[PDB]
Symmetry: C3
């Protein structure tokens, strides 16, 4: 069995023009003391990351601000801030409400 | 190719999670449960939707409108999910397998268990 | 690491009672040039398929229009139109908001 905690967040940003992004992050790990990892913690991490995207011109931070590339970008930074013993399992980034990218490790 | 039927249901419950060696602050939530069952498609279907929903809802019924701290030593979303999964597995017919349980405490935070 | 793009769409159909079906299609491929496949091309492929069921009595097109059989049929139609460097990874068909069939390849 695999156990993971999931957090959903959202942020806005424009590229080429100002969309709402729905982010879903799944973190895998063992259940210890009743939990994989603190919900608030993970949300703090993710929000710090998206705060750098929030209402900004992605085309300045990305050579090509595609949903796939924005997701890759986010995953790399989530991973760097994750505590030990857990791993980034999945990142789902929706640009709009029915169009998204799913990265799975 | 794998084929699964999925049922979504919800229940409400209040609880306070362990926040030191003591506890925390009682708050109420709507919990959203998603159960995925895997099986072979025979004569057009894996398992009757209603049959599964009834199994699942008999289980969530035990939690619905309850103070979870009265039922779990530490009612974290993970522990509740584990308990739900054990109960469901125990009642599934012999031709399907419990594949996944996703429990959401509200819509922004959840736990996913996969077999 | 695996990468997929996801498109969601909906259509109404009967089988006889009538329901709103919510379809989610996941396509797997390599991220190249910032993307796996353009969302619009995928959406066009999926909706060109779903339009055949929209506002129809599934019992006149399917011998046994179970959600499972519809999902299977949809998946094969999509598979036959996808570009060469991509693969149909998942089809989730919801008959209403609370019940669905997930097919994963």
């Amino acid at each position: 069995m695999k156990s993971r905690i999931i957090v959903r967040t959202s942020f806005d940003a424009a590229h080429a023009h100002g969309h709402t992004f729905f982010l879903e992050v799944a973190i895998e790990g063992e259940i210890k003391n009743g939990y994989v990892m603190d919900f608030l913690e993970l949300r703090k991490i993710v929000e710090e990351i998206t705060k750098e995207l929030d209402h900004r011109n992605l085309n300045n931070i990305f050579e090509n601000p595609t949903t796939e590339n924005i997701a890759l970008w986010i995953g790399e930074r989530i991973r760097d801030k994750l505590p030990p013993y857990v791993k980034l399992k999945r990142v789902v980034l929706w640009e709009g409400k029915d169009n998204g990218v799913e990265l799975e490790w």
